[PDB]
Structures are given as structure tokens and as C-alpha cells.
Amino acid sequence: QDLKTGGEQGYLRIATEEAFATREIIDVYLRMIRDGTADKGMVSLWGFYAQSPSERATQILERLLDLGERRIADMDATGIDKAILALTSPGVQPLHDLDEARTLATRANDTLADACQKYPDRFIGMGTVAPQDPEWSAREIHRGARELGFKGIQINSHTQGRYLDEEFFDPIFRALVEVDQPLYIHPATSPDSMIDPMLEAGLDGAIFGFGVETGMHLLRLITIGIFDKYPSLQIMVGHMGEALPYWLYRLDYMHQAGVRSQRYERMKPLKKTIEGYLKSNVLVTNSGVAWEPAIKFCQQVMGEDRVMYAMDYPYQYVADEVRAMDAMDMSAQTKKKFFQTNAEKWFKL
Amino acid sequence: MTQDLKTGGEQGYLRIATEEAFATREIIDVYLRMIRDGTADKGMVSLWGFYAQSPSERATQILERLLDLGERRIADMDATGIDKAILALTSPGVQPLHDLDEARTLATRANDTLADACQKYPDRFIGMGTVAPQDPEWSAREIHRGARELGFKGIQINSHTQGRYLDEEFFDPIFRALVEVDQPLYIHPATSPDSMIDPMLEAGLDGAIFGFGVETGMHLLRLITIGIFDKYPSLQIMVGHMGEALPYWLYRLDYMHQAGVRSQRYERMKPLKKTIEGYLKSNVLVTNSGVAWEPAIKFCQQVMGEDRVMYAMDYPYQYVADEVRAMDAMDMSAQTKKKFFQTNAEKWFKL
Numbered sequence A: 001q002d003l004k005t006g007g008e009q010g011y012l013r014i015a016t017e018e019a020f021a022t023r024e025i026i027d028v029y030l031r032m033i034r035d036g037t038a039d040k041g042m043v044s045l046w047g048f049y050a051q052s053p054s055e056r057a058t059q060i061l062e063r064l065l066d067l068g069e070r071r072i073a074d075m076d077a078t079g080i081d082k083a084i085l086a087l088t089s090p091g092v093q094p095l096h097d098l099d100e101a102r103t104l105a106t107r108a109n110d111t112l113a114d115a116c117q118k119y120p121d122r123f124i125g126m127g128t129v130a131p132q133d134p135e136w137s138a139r140e141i142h143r144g145a146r147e148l149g150f151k152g153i154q155i156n157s158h159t160q161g162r163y164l165d166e167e168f169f170d171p172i173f174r175a176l177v178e179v180d181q182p183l184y185i186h187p188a189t190s191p192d193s194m195i196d197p198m199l200e201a202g203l204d205g206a207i208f209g210f211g212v213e214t215g216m217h218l219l220r221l222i223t224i225g226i227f228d229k230y231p232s233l234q235i236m237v238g239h240m241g242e243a244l245p246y247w248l249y250r251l252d253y254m255h256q257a258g259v260r261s262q263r264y265e266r267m268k269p270l271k272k273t274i275e276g277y278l279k280s281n282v283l284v285t286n287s288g289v290a291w292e293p294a295i296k297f298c299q300q301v302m303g304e305d306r307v308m309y310a311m312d313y314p315y316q317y318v319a320d321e322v323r324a325m326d327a328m329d330m331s332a333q334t335k336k337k338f339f340q341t342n343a344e345k346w347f348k349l
Numbered sequence B: 001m002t003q004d005l006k007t008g009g010e011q012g013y014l015r016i017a018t019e020e021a022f023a024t025r026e027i028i029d030v031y032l033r034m035i036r037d038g039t040a041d042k043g044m045v046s047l048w049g050f051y052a053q054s055p056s057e058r059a060t061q062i063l064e065r066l067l068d069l070g071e072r073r074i075a076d077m078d079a080t081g082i083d084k085a086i087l088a089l090t091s092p093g094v095q096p097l098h099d100l101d102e103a104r105t106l107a108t109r110a111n112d113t114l115a116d117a118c119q120k121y122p123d124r125f126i127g128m129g130t131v132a133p134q135d136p137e138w139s140a141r142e143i144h145r146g147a148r149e150l151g152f153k154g155i156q157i158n159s160h161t162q163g164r165y166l167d168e169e170f171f172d173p174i175f176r177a178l179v180e181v182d183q184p185l186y187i188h189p190a191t192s193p194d195s196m197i198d199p200m201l202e203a204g205l206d207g208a209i210f211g212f213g214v215e216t217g218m219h220l221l222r223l224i225t226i227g228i229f230d231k232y233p234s235l236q237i238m239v240g241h242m243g244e245a246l247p248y249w250l251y252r253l254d255y256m257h258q259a260g261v262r263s264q265r266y267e268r269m270k271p272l273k274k275t276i277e278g279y280l281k282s283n284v285l286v287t288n289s290g291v292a293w294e295p296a297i298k299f300c301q302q303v304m305g306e307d308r309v310m311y312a313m314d315y316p317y318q319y320v321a322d323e324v325r326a327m328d329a330m331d332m333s334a335q336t337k338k339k340f341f342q343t344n345a346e347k348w349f350k351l
């Protein structure tokens, strides 16, 4: 049952959706909860992770904060060769003070780069940005790529209730295409405009609301035509595609109906079907979904080259999940793509 | 290869379509009244402002077919080889109506209208009752009236009622009644309530494309996590659109449900007697309305059991002869295909 690094089983295990935190940013969340400027999602999510005495919450916070020996030990213990790291949701996106947001993002990016310099064979970085300032975010995308060795950026879904399909956010996509790097749209809690019915049932987080928020965000980017404007752009999402691959037949059928009937101002003709974009511009990881039928379904729909392994450490750190993935009824060749070579291609490792 | 889609079961199965819609003119007129007077919620403005007033080819044909409960509907069924249709008043029914007497009156008339049509075409039309969850005790009486007097086989509730969900204790009499008559509840989509709709509406995603699945999947999930099936172990809830993504999310649902329960994170997420997977296998039933897509059907048959997945057309919102032809030609055993088109529905609706 021992899980080992080194690839002796035929592939490296590259985990592509792995989280860290900085104490000063967590402290901002606590400040916002204390002063009443935190949104309902931040109260729910970070009220829990930063303050709950539960074993799950306390271990997640300890592990999030570590970018050294302890993290490496946890990777070694589960045979994870490399982890692609990003500042944990929601990043600096909810912060009202632009100067504070840019300062703390800069610090989090420098901290991550330092950690990758210490463990260059184990840690790979994705930058964090502050979409409330799109041109600054463009500057930081360039700095991450040029100076910090990062492989792309992670945006934690909406920024203060606004979505990346607005023309306002264009400089972010412009810069991503300039540096030729992927965008990972990671979940966040829904904004206050949407969260209420999920919050009241305890469904606002990873169990449901994360998938709603993130699937909605990817879908609206597809339907605004982001991939016609930027045909080279790759967007990555976790959690087996936030249900979009399973909804695909219905997405394309209803999208076509809406386009033809002129029902909506922001749903005009696209050069490809939604299926077409999934095959050429969208990439999926299995974070949180260590489940062979769903993985195989997604591989069939999108292509086995477009589906990657992710652990979602430390929110879902489970050695038996790694064992289950190693044991799937897949060819050695498919397994190697899923664990290793797809990530090497798409993140340009 | 034939373009022929014939009634009569010569393929080896009847085609029983399990999520089919009709409208009444007087109820559509109430939606228009609410839109005009500003009492319609954003979902109604979006959905019914579209279907009742759009000049689009798609909307105009939909409205005509919805209103027919006779020879045209039968001809449309005959032309696509549909033997039987299970009919329900189209979403959101009378659920958004603030006047309780008007809601009960209009639901009663819609139920009586549907029952008359089923009596006229008894080998073709099967009815599901509509109710007014704003009044759960009246709704319970109407579930009984539909079962005993009108020959209905269950009820369809169009997800939320004025922003409230069925997991509230207030709605319990509806569940007591369903268990008493031993009939299934079909939770059909509706637009999200005003508390949730805004970001989807802006992007044109509030309807069938996405918001329907968000609203309905959320509603089913919150009923499972409140423990509805521990309270009422016999209760069957049906949903369409391949389970509103829940079967695909199952591993994540169970993992994060356990994490929530164990960490005592939320008041309304307490221990359940079965896993979410367990409830899908014993208490939830799925149709493929709007999802004429073999990989998704087969996935759902694997997760839930092939006995628990039924064919539905979603007429007239999705009336596509080519979809019936695709379903007929799936790489599925004759036995499984017959369960999917016919015998599962015969069992679960007690046809």
C-alpha cells in the first residue's frame, strides 16, 4: 500500500489544483468578518476554515500555511511528485482597498516564487491577481511569467459579484494570450446576489455552490465568445469540469435555441459549438472527484488529452484516493497522460 | 434505416414520454397580468415574457402546442411514435400567485381540465396533478382528490414556491399526503427566485440552459440533506434532465456532505441514515428529458440502476423526431431499452 514518489509505477503524479495560504491574507479575512465588510460567502467559508476547532478545519489551515518540510512530507507520504500551487480562494478578490489587494497579491506571489525556488522539482506556481484592477493584473501576469517562473494564473471565480465576461476585464485575457499561459478558474462562494438559498441549506461551499458559481462562470465566458476573440486561450477548471461535460448535450441544444430566437443580448452566434470549445479551449482536472466513472465520462467527451489529475490538497488529502486513481481500469498509456504528460503539456513544465 | 416512427410498440416497447407539458390560457393570462402590473418575479418576466410574447418561431409554436390537449397533440405524438404522454401543467404553474384563492381556483380548474383530457384519450394521456404549496393543507387535499377522483398518478411541483423550498417544515403536509396515496413527486424546474437569479439572468443563463438545473438540483439536494427520505422511506422523487447533474456530482456530493456532517458545520446538515448514493438508488428516479444523449443516459443507468432511468421527450419545449430516432438506436440490450422506454414508467407511475 506504500505510495512513492519517483515514477516507478510508470508515471510521475503531478497534482494540478493544490492550495496554500498566507497568514496576513487570512488575517484580512478575519478583519473583514469582524468589521462586517465580509460578504456572506466569506463569513461562511472563512469563518469556518479560519476559526472552527474541528479537526478538518484546523488541519486544513495548518497545511495551507506550510510551504516547506511539512507540505513536502505530506506529498512524499502520498507519492505526489509535483504540486501546482495557487493562493487559496478567494485570494485578494474580495478586498475593497485596491492598494491593499495589489500589495498582498504581490507579497503572496513573491512568497510562492521563493518556495518554488527552494523546491524547484516539487513546487510549480500559478500567480494570483486582483481583477478589480485589470491592467495591474495584466502587469502581474507578465511579472509572474517573466520574473517569477509561474506557469499561469488562478482566478477565484467572481470578483465582488462581477464576472470575467465583462469587457472591463479584457486586459487579463489580453495578457494571458501575450504570455501564452492558461487561466485556471477555481471556485469561490457565490456573491451575495446569488448565495442566499444555498447558504441557508449549508450548500454554499464545495458540496454544491462552488460548482454552480464556477460552471456558471466558465459557461458565460464561452457564450460571450471569449474563445473566438482569443482562439489560443486555454481555460482550466477542476471538479470534473463543474458538471459542464455532463450537461453538454443540453448546453448546446439550449444555447442554439437562445441564439436563433434572439432571446438574449449577450448570447449571439459563436464560431464553434460548446462541444467544440470543450475540445479545443477548455481543460479539466479531477480535483475532488476521485471517481473512475466520472473521469472516464469526461475523457470520452473532451478527449483523454484534456483531463488531468489533481488532489485538491489540503481540502481533500486522502491517500486512498491516490490508490484508487493508480488502480483505475485504464491503459498504462492513458494513465500516464492523466497523471503526468497532460499537465506537462498544458502547463509547459 | 427508416424515418418511420410508429406508435403500437412494434420496436419491442411502447414509447412512454414521462415529462410532457401543457398550459391553460387563463393561467398564461395571469402571468401576463403579473408582468404588466409588476408583481411578476424576474424569472417569470424572463421566461413567460419570452414564451407568451416572443415573435420567435420557437416560442410561438411552443405556446400553440402547450395549449392543445386534443387532436393536434395526438397527431404530434403519432408523428414521433409516442404511445403515451405523462402530462403536467407547465412551470411555474400557480406557485408564484400571491392570491391564495386564485391559486387554488386556477389549480383546481387546470386539474379538472387535464382529467377531462385523460378521460377522452385514456390510452394516450396520463395526468400529474398541479398544486399550490402556498397552501400545503389544500395541496394535500388536492393530492388526494387527484389520486382518488381524477385518476392522476402523482404530482409535479415546479421547484420553489415564491422563494421557499420543500425542506421547510411548513410543507410537510404535502409529503404526508404523497405517502398516504403512495405516489411520486416530480420536481420540475422553474426559474430561480429573485434571491438567486441575477447573475444567471444577466448572461442569458436563467432558463433551461443552466439555471433550471441549478434550481432543481439544489432543491432535490436540500430535500435529501434535510433527511426527507429518512422521514418518509417510501417516498419517490422524480427529476428530469438526467438528474439535474446530481448523478455526475455524486462522489463530490457524498464526500463534502460527510465532511460537513462530521465537522458539525451547519444546523440543517445533520447525520443521515444512508449516503446520498444510497438515496439515489432507493428514493430518487430520473428521466432523460432534454438529454437525448447516450453517454449521459448510460452513465446515469450505471450510477442509479437501469430500473431507475426513464425516457422523456419534454414536449413541446424539445419536440425533435431525430431525438426519438437516436434513442431507438442506442447500443443497449433490448431488455434495457424496453425498461428505459416503457416498463420503468409502468412501474414507478403504476400505469
Ligand SMILES: [Ca+2]
Pocket (backbone or CB within 6 Å): A017, A019, A186, A287, A312, A315
Ligand atoms: Ca481547490
Ligand SMILES: [Ca+2]
Pocket (backbone or CB within 6 Å): B019, B021, B188, B289, B314, B317
Ligand atoms: Ca419540462
Ligand SMILES: [Cl-]
Pocket (backbone or CB within 6 Å): none
Ligand atoms: Cl509596482
Ligand SMILES: [Cl-]
Pocket (backbone or CB within 6 Å): A165, A166, A167, A168
Ligand atoms: Cl461587457
Ligand SMILES: [Cl-]
Pocket (backbone or CB within 6 Å): A045, A205, A206, A207
Ligand atoms: Cl466548502
Ligand SMILES: [Cl-]
Pocket (backbone or CB within 6 Å): A256, A259, A260
Ligand atoms: Cl445556429
Ligand SMILES: [Cl-]
Pocket (backbone or CB within 6 Å): A271, A272, A273, A275, A276, A277
Ligand atoms: Cl464546432
Ligand SMILES: [Cl-]
Pocket (backbone or CB within 6 Å): B120, B121, B122, B123, B124
Ligand atoms: Cl385513447
Ligand SMILES: [Cl-]
Pocket (backbone or CB within 6 Å): B167, B168, B169, B170
Ligand atoms: Cl424547517
Ligand SMILES: [Cl-]
Pocket (backbone or CB within 6 Å): B047, B207, B208, B209
Ligand atoms: Cl428556458
Ligand SMILES: [Cl-]
Pocket (backbone or CB within 6 Å): B179, B231, B232, B233, B234, B235
Ligand atoms: Cl414512508
Ligand SMILES: [Cl-]
Pocket (backbone or CB within 6 Å): A054, A055, A056, A057, B262, B263
Ligand atoms: Cl472534522
